[PDB]
Design a protein around this ligand. Structure first.
Ligand SMILES: Nc1nc2c(ncn2[C@@H]2O[C@H](COP(=O)(O)OP(=O)(O)O)[C@@H](O)[C@H]2O)c(=O)[nH]1
Ligand SMILES: Nc1nc2c(ncn2[C@@H]2O[C@H](COP(=O)(O)OP(=O)(O)O)[C@@H](O)[C@H]2O)c(=O)[nH]1
Ligand SMILES: Nc1nc2c(ncn2[C@@H]2O[C@H](COP(=O)(O)OP(=O)(O)O)[C@@H](O)[C@H]2O)c(=O)[nH]1
Ligand SMILES: Nc1nc2c(ncn2[C@@H]2O[C@H](COP(=O)(O)OP(=O)(O)O)[C@@H](O)[C@H]2O)c(=O)[nH]1
Lengths: 299, 241, 297, 234
């Protein structure tokens, strides 16, 4: 490095980038995948603390004859930061009598977004800034069976860990005691190792020169899958209002670490690994899709 | 002694074994049918009880025609009784467990109850009621009943002896095997960091209603309807054909 | 558009981005274009306050027989921020007897960087992060004649403004009195308008909606071309150790706004419009280069 | 009275007109001729000033010094045919204050013209340089002149010769500083004085050109540069 003899002003550079962001807004695409009735819409509304799901939990739901993929778009503002958020859900996944090819529409959706981006990129008359419809996060909901993963879950996770970031969560964790939750987590982790399902955060995608990030992400992986509880209703406990669920024997607290693990999931999605998810999507998954497709479109 | 046959149908991990242990207060514990015989000596009268579990139900990626095994089992018992006419091992009750989802009947449940409602008495139970709030439980019950009445499914209607208890169908059950000490009180229940969900509590789950109706109040009407309706109809075609 | 009901945490995003730049550092490329003996090396040393230029101003210099392009690279540390700085000088420019087609090496250098970026982008085995060697700034040095632009200066600026961000500066402005400085700036601006030379900042490359940033760039445009003075020797004036030049009649202070417009240039390059220069290079000049080649191929 | 002629060559924008007005206190490349009658100090001087406009201005300066040579040859031919001294006696070349060395155009001009007219190198706009910078530039310029074997006009009799090439500052404006009237240039940091030996070398140049050593220029023109042309012609 060349030593400096005064103040130059490179430190201001970050602020400049910040200012540019204020005029555009960051794009985030979440996709929830799981069987109907596991709390996907409620969890999306709990993470973003707004009615951002396509179907509100109150409205009636009918299982369609086919597996559909539905998307909804929103703009969320906080302290000058705009988030263009696209939440995509899978009505009819894992509910039919015959669930074969239930993961096909999901992968078709992800690959079609990649295709849109690559076609906008290759064109001669290209835009200055390419809109990003690529799925940045995929949250997979595991029913709280307490025994092991279902076969459909294993199949879909194996297919999906290859084209999109997947973060497993035990849906409706309020139904498991602490011992049961621990045993279920141990079984789920052993099964993930056995089937070699490498979920986000993949430590292979992190640089070796950085150790603090490696240890932090190792702790995050050691915590997975997350025992989550989602709810958009607040209740008075003690002398404070807490988001939670009310049953005759108590109230499950969403924001209490000793009750659930929603805190860790929301911290990773929003506060600690959002940009890492976007970077892995744009530098590991889209890059591999682009390589594979162009190695076929050589001519 | 007394004879009874109870079949358990549902997806795995829905508290089926725990509920079966809880009702009968005993350590009783490819879709086929597995049979378990127990000899329960309680309340004076001795019951030789049969449990027909159907393991592997709903645990496959493709579940087409997975209800043919239970149909075959019921009809085989029917034929064995008909031949013996010239011990009542007929399956008298069938507990179906519906996942606590909160939306309505899945297509698999509709198909099972559409192709089994004229073979065996179907008692729908909402498995794991300790994961729903009361409002969700009522909404789910209403939606399930509406879809049952829409598809023309004939379930089992309990007879007159509890008026508000027999109208709780489908039942929402909670099962536990661990005895906890709540203020010096020996109670069966599940302990969460936020409280104790008690099995025998009438405001928590319908376990007491089901225990009373099935175990010791209406265990003979099930046999009577099985003999006079389902078995009679089954003979009404095989002999006719 | 969608009301919230609590702390989701989206505001943390900026901090996250910072932690991801902190490990990789930013990269900047400046090109100084002018004749010899106009303070280019001293100005580059003064902007970054370090011995960054290829040639230290006090060593030696012999005029090359051809216009050559030379590049030096450095890593600059500033409160945790790494800047990969490239400085490109053009020795031999505007100093020959015949200066016909003396803009070819400069345009060739810029187009070569565009070619490298495009050929790495189209490549199927593409790298995750393409190193940007593109020329982000072009500081053009005009000698302090006091009459008008040279024809060799008009030609090169006219060719350069179509592909590169050009920022005209009046070199060695301490040789100009204020009245002469104002007349020279007025004449240069009139000649730029007459020959249709559009220098950075250009208001046609800005969003219509934004106005508070449009006005600032309009002020910067009206102030061009800057009157700069560069130095690296610290002199004691009064009780202050200040950068400047000690003549036989006074100390010309570089950082003083009443003396020279160096502060405007350094604030525009380093503190206010660095990322705007990079963005305009990547989105206006690189894109026009891309559309021309792909139509050709 | 006394006839003399001075030819000013250099790039446009270098204080040539200002320096001419300061020395004599009066207000395509084609040589432009002007005639002035200056009755300074009682001696009438008929001064012919030949400016070279367009020198070093176009993009192509190839053989732009031919007009200068053709001008001197034509004056030499006119005198020989007559045999009014219209021969170009002095030529002042202005070097831009780059701080490095001589440009190719300067080298070419002083190569082609140093055997046809007396050349006095001047560093135009001497206020551009700190004293150390000016001394270094002078040393490098003299080294390069000796490498190119360029012969400049040395001054007879009348410490001041060591200042060659002269660093000159020209200014037509008189200003009031320290309760005295001085010719100079005004900057926020101070006033650069034309007639200060510690600031520039204008006073030495004025003394040499006007006061003392001018008939020597005429003599060295008649006895060296005019003889060689006539020798080649004959
Ligand atoms: N026990 C429990 N129930 C939940 C939770 N989140 C939602 N529910 C309930 O489950 C039902 C279905 O949830 P919903 O979000 O509509 O499921 P989705 O169809 O998977 O989106 C709703 O009545 C919710 O009130 C949870 O975290 N725990
Ligand atoms: N939430 C809830 N969990 C239960 C209940 N009964 C049993 N479980 C738990 O569910 C898990 C699997 O159910 P299990 O009793 O083995 O019966 P299965 O349905 O035959 O698998 C075990 O961890 C049980 O402890 C219940 O009533 N509510
Ligand atoms: N008048 C003036 N002279 C300068 C300035 N900066 C540098 N110089 C002098 O110019 C001479 C050579 O400058 P240099 O940096 O080598 O210019 P370059 O050859 O074009 O890179 C040095 O002696 C410097 O002291 C300035 O801002 N104004
Ligand atoms: N720094 C400096 N500037 C000068 C000097 N003499 C003249 N100038 C300015 O430079 C400009 C060019 O002067 P001019 O004599 O017209 O140059 P010419 O075209 O070479 O004759 C004018 O604005 C003068 O005021 C000088 O000695 N030093």
């Amino acid at each position: 490095t060349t030593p400096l003899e005064g103040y130059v002003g490179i430190d201001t550079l970050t602020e400049q980038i910040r200012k540019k962001a204020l005029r555009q807004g960051f794009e985030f695409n979440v996709m929830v995948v799981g069987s109907a009735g596991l709390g996907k819409s409620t969890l999306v509304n709990t993470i973003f603390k707004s009615k951002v799901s396509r179907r509100q939990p109150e409205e009636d739901y009918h299982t369609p004859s086919t597996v559909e993929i539905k998307t909804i778009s929103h703009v969320i503002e906080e302290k000058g930061i705009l988030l263009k958020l696209s939440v995509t859900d899978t009505p009819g996944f894992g509910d039919q009598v015959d669930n074969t090819n239930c993961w096909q529409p999901i992968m078709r959706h992800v690959n079609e977004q990649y295709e849109k981006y690559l076609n906008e990129e290759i064109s001669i008359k290209r835009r200055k800034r390419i809109p990003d419809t690529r799925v940045h996060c995929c949250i997979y909901f595991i029913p709280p069976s307490g025994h092991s993963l279902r076969l459909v879950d294993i199949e879909v996770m194996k297919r999906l860990v290859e084209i999109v970031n997947v973060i497993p969560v035990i849906a409706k964790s309020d139904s498991l005691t602490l011992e049961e939750r621990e045993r279920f987590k141990a079984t789920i982790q052993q099964q993930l190792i056995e089937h070699n399902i490498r979920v986000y955060p993949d430590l292979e995608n992190l640089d070796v020169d950085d150790e603090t990030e490696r240890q932090r992400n190792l702790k995050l992986k050691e915590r997975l899958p997350f025992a989550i509880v989602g709810s958009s209703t607040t209740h008075q406990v003690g002398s404070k209002a807490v988001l939670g669920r009310k049953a005759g024997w108590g109230v499950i607290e969403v924001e209490n670490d000793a009750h659930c693990e929603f805190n860790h999931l929301r911290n990773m999605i929003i506060r600690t690994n959002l940009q890492d998810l976007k970077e892995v999507t744009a530098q590991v998954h889209y890059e591999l899709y682009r390589h594979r497709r162009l190695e076929t479109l050589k001519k | 002694g007394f004879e009874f046959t109870l079949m358990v149908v549902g997806e795995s991990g829905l508290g089926k074994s725990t509920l079966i242990n809880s009702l009968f207060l005993s350590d009783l514990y490819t879709v086929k049918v597995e049979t378990t015989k127990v000899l329960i000596k309680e309340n004076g009268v001795t019951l030789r009880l049969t449990i027909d579990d159907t393991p592997g139900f709903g645990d496959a990626v493709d579940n087409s025609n997975c209800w043919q095994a239970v149909i075959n089992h019921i009809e085989k018992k029917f034929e064995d009784y008909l031949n013996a006419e010239s011990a009542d091992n007929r399956v008298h009750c069938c507990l179906y467990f519906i996942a606590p989802t909160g939306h309505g009947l899945k297509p698999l449940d509709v198909e099972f109850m559409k192709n089994l409602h004229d073979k065996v008495n179907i008692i729908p139970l909402i498995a794991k009621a300790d994961t729903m709030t009361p409002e969700e439980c009522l909404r789910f019950k209403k939606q399930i009943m509406k879809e049952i009445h829409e598809h023309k499914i004939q379930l089992y209607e309990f007879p007159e002896c509890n008026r508000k208890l027999k109208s709780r169908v489908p039942f929402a059950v909670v099962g536990s095997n661990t005895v906890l000490e709540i203020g010096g009180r020996r109670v069966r229940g599940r302990q969460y960091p936020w409280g104790v969900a008690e099995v025998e509590n009438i405001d928590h789950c319908d376990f007491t209603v089901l225990r009373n109706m099935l175990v010791r109040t209406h265990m003979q009407d099930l046999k009577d309807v099985t003999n006079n309706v389902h078995y009679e109809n089954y003979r009404s075609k095989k002999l006719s054909s």
